[PDB]
Amino acid sequence: HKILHRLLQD
Amino acid sequence: HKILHRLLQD
Amino acid sequence: SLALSLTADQMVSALLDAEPPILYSEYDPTRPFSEASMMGLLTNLADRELVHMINWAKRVPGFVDLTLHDQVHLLECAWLEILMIGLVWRSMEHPGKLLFAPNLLLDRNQGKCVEGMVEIFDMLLATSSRFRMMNLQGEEFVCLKSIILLNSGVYTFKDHIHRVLDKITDTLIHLMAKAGLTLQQQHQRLAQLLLILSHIRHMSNKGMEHLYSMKCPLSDLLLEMLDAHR
Amino acid sequence: LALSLTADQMVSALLDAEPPILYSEYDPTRPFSEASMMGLLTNLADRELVHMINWAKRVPGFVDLTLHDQVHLLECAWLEILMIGLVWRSMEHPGKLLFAPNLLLDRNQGKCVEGMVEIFDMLLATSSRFRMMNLQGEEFVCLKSIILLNSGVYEEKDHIHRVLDKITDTLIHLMAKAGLTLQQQHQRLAQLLLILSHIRHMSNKGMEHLYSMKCKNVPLSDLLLEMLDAHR
Ligand SMILES: CCC(=C(c1ccc(O)cc1)c1ccc(O)cc1)c1cccc(Nc2cccc(C)c2)c1
Ligand SMILES: CCC(=C(c1ccc(O)cc1)c1ccc(O)cc1)c1cccc(Nc2cccc(C)c2)c1
């Protein structure tokens, strides 16, 4: 959900 | 001055 | 400065001897907790503890060699950190609880009695648990508390202070070496302990932020201590 | 796997993962204003954040952590990391903060933003402290990794502590290699970690002021806005 989460996820 | 001043000297 | 000529053992003994007494709260069990009365109790306790903190600071080796204004500055910067590390230390033997005073032992559930305090409460409990799992010795605690005093405001105004800080480091290592810890365990433990000081700093900042928010009872001494952080 | 790394392998790993020095969008023709300089710093920080996230993944032991834990540590440590970075690149510039190669400022220009002079002096003092200690790049990358793993660490917190212990061993290994006596090693190690206390302090004061002007409304980017909310 969070941008940081998405970035870390990629 | 400060109360802390007086406390340090005493 | 006579503080540099000292040995490790007599540095330890000087610090143990300088230790302030454990004060009691005005705590009243027949009355329950409101946000106002809770903060009132804590404020009254902190205010009295502060007077003894000043006597303790004067007895910290090297502190008296400082300019009066440098002493004032260091105390203004570090006072809440010092109270907190005290609170954390005496709360070690009470997992899940904070021993503000022998007649004032509180769990995190009672931290909810004042808006948002449960956050800094959980942080303190965590630090306490951390000390407990580390088996923080009193000889180590007194070194850590002295370090906070000298370090916290050292970059906000010096060589003498850093030399005393080195001296206290030597003392910490001396304590760990005596306890039988290997050379690797010595530097690792040293690092672990000093890293906790960063969290104590954080807790103090968060707490301080809240404190100069409800100035919007507090003794005149606190009002001046609090104003120093503005 | 991160625990199987020797001291040298740890150092080379951290060095190879080092993010670049980004430029600001500073226009030397355009007159300075409180909104613009903060805008420059905000714009710069937002781009550094992207590098920091990918840098975080290459820090040994970090990717072993839970996704939610990775998120937490970064949310907690991001401004500390930006500040120690700033301080490090400003070492060779006494009395000046090198926010970017094209953005070098003394405290007088820090007065452009109301009240920045306080945090400015603390950053200068820190950089001055690093210069006096003659901080090495190998030591810097260790410190920065310690900040990332330490700042938000307060239920298999043990792995992180195991990694932190490895970084400590790496620091000591560096100091022994530089010819320091055992007493000198322990003192220097302590001096370095005590500075992290001031970096935490500068971060907190920084966040505070940042969260205040988020409400003042007067250009925060979307990732930077979610970072701020993690502290409120
Ligand atoms: C951690 C409690 C604390 C104290 C304190 C700490 C150690 C002691 O031995 C004695 C007292 C404190 C309370 C009132 C003071 O005037 C000074 C120190 C403290 C510090 C700051 C804030 C809070 N609680 C709080 C208040 C409002 C909002 C929030 C989120 C927390 C407690
Ligand atoms: C220390 C400066 C700082 C920056 C910053 C720091 C290092 C970097 O590499 C990049 C940027 C910063 C500025 C804006 C951001 O959104 C993020 C980082 C900073 C941080 C917080 C506050 C301030 N200055 C300040 C002081 C007082 C009042 C206000 C509103 C701001 C600078």
Please characterize this protein's 3D structure:
Chains A, B: It comes from Homo sapiens. Chains A, B: It is found in: Nucleus. Chains A, B: Belongs to the SRC/p160 nuclear receptor coactivator family. The complex is a heterotetramer, with two copies of chain A (10 residues) and two copies of chain C. With 10 residues, chain A is mainly α. Chain A has one helix at 3-9. The radius of gyration of chain A is 5 Å and the shape is elongated. The relative contact order of chain A is 0.36. Chain C is 64% helix and 4% strand. Chain C is built from eight helices and two strands, in the order αααββααααα. In chain C, α4 (117-134) packs antiparallel against α7 and α5 runs antiparallel to α6. The longest helix of chain C has 29 residues, at 183-211. Chain C is globular, with a radius of gyration of 18 Å. The two termini of chain C are 33 Å apart. Classes of the chains: A mainly alpha (10), C mainly alpha (230). Chains in contact: A-D, B-C, C-D. The C-D interface holds C 123, 126-127, 130, 147, 151-152, 155-156, 162, 165-166, 169-170, 172-173, 183-184, 186-188, 190-192, 194-195, 197-199, 201-202, 205-206, 209 and D 121-122, 125-126, 129, 146, 150-151, 154, 161, 164-165, 168-169, 171-172, 182-183, 185-187, 189-191, 193-194, 196-198, 200-201, 204-205, 208. Bound molecules: ligand 5C9 (2 copies). One copy of the ligand CCC(=C(c1ccc(O)cc1)c1ccc(O)cc1)c1cccc(Nc2cccc(C)c2)c1 is lined by residues 38, 41-42, 44-45, 48, 82-83, 85-86, 99, 113, 115-116, 119, 123, 206, 209-210, 213, 224 of chain D.
